[PDB]
């Protein structure tokens, strides 16, 4: 569905999984008191490229979807699929999991791209 930017904010994570193409397009937006717009449009592109670099150094290199080989640690809110993808929304989700995102990203990049990329290199080196 195309409900505008953040249109599916309050919707469940299962339904909000299809609006990802929306909240991405609106992530870039195409003297004195004019320094504001320049500084803002520089901060915007810097933040977008920071997020894109975080995404690239993971085993995704692409948008709106991603998968990997890192297992979901049972300590990190052990639940079921419907208990998360249908009982919550992204807001409550990141609120309850605003603990481990940094270490999760670190593991995702270290244990995968420093291992699976070199694995691909060595399996193609033969």
């Amino acid at each position: 569905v195309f409900l505008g930017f953040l249109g599916a904010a309050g919707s469940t994570m299962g339904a909000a999984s299809m609006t990802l193409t929306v909240q991405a397009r609106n992530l870039l937006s195409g003297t004195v008191w004019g320094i504001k717009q320049l500084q803002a449009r520089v901060l915007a592109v810097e933040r977008y490229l920071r997020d894109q670099q975080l995404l690239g150094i993971w085993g995704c290199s692409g948008k709106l979807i991603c998968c990997t080989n890192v297992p979901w640690n049972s300590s990190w809110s052990n639940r079921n699929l419907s208990e998360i993808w249908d009982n919550m929304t992204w807001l409550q989700w990141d609120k309850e999991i605003s603990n481990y995102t940094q270490i999760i990203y670190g593991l995702l990049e270290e244990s995968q791209n420093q291992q699976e990329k070199n694995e691909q290199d060595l399996l193609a080196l033969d």
């Binding site: 290199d121 193609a124 080196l125 033969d126």
Partner: protein
């Protein structure tokens, strides 16, 4: 067969230069004191000085071709003017001053001119007959008694540094942006300008106080377990010998007289802070230095300086030859007011083979033109009460002079008027490089179609 493979993120850098931003501490951020001269909106420093040491690494450091001091010097100058433009202008200040000597007895030297002059008050129509107590170095007689005027009030438009700001050098961490890294050569015995075995990739430069001291460097990093003397070219006698001390030499400077403030309105709402009557006893400024330590400190330098000139030669220390008052003497600011100390009793010795303190006559000067920016002179307002300030002498800017007739003896003289030598004594173990993560290498890897 061998195929080229692209590697991204490789540890590869090249010597380059870029605009290094700042990083100030947040522990003293509560001390804004209405925009202290150096740091107003400097980004907060990194809470953790994460420094990385590197092995099997060499880098050809060069403290005399370093592009960081050029960026720091022009930064300090440009940052200085932006702290004076919103201050008060004293263009109507220097009128014919009827200066007479202050109430004293014989054996004075001067050095205190009681000047009374007409000053435009708030109202343009009315005028004001107000007096002040200027120093001899600030006034010059123009040619009944004698009449004087401000020394730099031809030539240049005098500007009073509005006293809400301060001059205390607050540490500054010159940090490099993304893609650039600052390499800290952690080697002990290294006069710069050579390869460095121990190179450490540090977030950025350590806290560096932008101190202005010329000879007798103050508030500076100590040497590495031995006095470090650094020169661009030892043979080049003119090259300033940067003597980094290993042990801090105490120095106690004191503005002994108790002066008051006048804040004489010249505006509407513009006030020339002038020196009122000096309450108390009339003495002159001085700087004390433990003779036991200073003798021992200079001797430790001769033992190191003898290395670069013969197996054994006569090293002589003599007071500065001449020039402007900011080079012949020890020009520096401690308590917001600048005073110059001649330091003839500091470089007096002569070394051939192998409790008290020295008192240096100091002269105070308020109309200042540091960095020799002609056409732009600063006026330093007085500071109420005495000014006691104890610093640590950690440097020496020596210059060599010799007729070189068979090189029998050698005389070392102080100097270093240029303020870049004050920065090179701190920016010698640092250099910036841009990371080049794109790298090619041959490998049996070969993609599909």
């Amino acid at each position: 067969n061998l195929w080229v493979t692209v590697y991204y993120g490789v540890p590869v850098w090249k010597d380059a230069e870029t605009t290094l931003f700042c990083a100030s501490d947040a522990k003293a951020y509560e001390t804004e004191k209405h925009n202290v001269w150096a740091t107003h909106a400097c980004v907060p420093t990194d809470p953790n000085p994460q420094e990385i040491h590197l092995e099997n690494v060499t880098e050809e450091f060069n403290m005399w071709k370093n592009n960081m001091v050029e960026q720091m010097h022009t930064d300090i100058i440009s940052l200085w003017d932006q702290s004076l433009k919103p201050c008060v202008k004293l263009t109507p200040l220097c009128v014919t001053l009827q200066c007479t000597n202050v109430t004293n007895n014989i054996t004075d030297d001067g050095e205190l001119k009681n000047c009374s002059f007409n000053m435009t008050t708030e109202l343009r129509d009315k005028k004001q007959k107000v007096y002040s107590l200027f120093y001899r170095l600030d006034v010059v007689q123009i040619n009944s008694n004698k009449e004087y005027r401000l020394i730099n009030c031809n030539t240049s438009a005098i500007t009073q540094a509005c006293p809400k700001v301060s001059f205390e050098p607050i540490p500054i961490h010159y940090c490099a942006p993304a893609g650039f890294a600052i390499l800290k050569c952690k080697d002990k015995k290294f006069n710069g300008t050579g390869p460095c075995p121990s190179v450490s990739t540090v977030q950025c430069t350590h806290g560096i106080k932008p101190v202005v001291s010329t000879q007798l460097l103050l508030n500076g990093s100590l040497a590495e377990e031995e006095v470090m003397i650094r020169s661009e070219n030892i043979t080049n006698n003119a090259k300033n010998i940067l003597v980094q001390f290993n042990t801090p030499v105490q120095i106690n400077c004191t503005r002994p007289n108790n002066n008051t403030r006048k804040s004489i309105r010249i505006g509407p709402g513009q006030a020339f802070y002038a020196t009122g009557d000096i309450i108390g006893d009339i003495r002159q400024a001085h700087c004390n230095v433990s003779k036991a330590t200073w003798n021992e400190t200079l001797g430790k330098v001769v033992k190191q300086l003898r290395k670069h000139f013969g197996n054994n030669t006569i090293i002589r220390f003599a007071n500065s030859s001449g020039g402007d008052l900011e080079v012949t003497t020890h020009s520096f600011n401690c308590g917001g007011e600048f005073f110059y100390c001649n330091t003839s009793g500091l470089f007096n010795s002569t070394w051939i083979s192998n409790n008290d303190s020295i008192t240096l006559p100091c002269r105070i000067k308020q109309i200042i033109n540091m960095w020799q920016r002609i056409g732009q002179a600063m006026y330093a307002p007085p500071i109420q009460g005495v000014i006691r300030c104890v610093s640590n002498i950690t440097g020496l800017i020596l210059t060599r002079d010799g007729g070189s007739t068979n090189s029998t003896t050698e005389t070392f003289r102080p100097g270093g008027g240029d303020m870049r030598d004050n920065w090179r004594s701190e920016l010698y173990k640092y250099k910036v490089v841009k990371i080049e993560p794109l790298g090619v290498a041959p490998t049996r890897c070969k993609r599909r179609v």
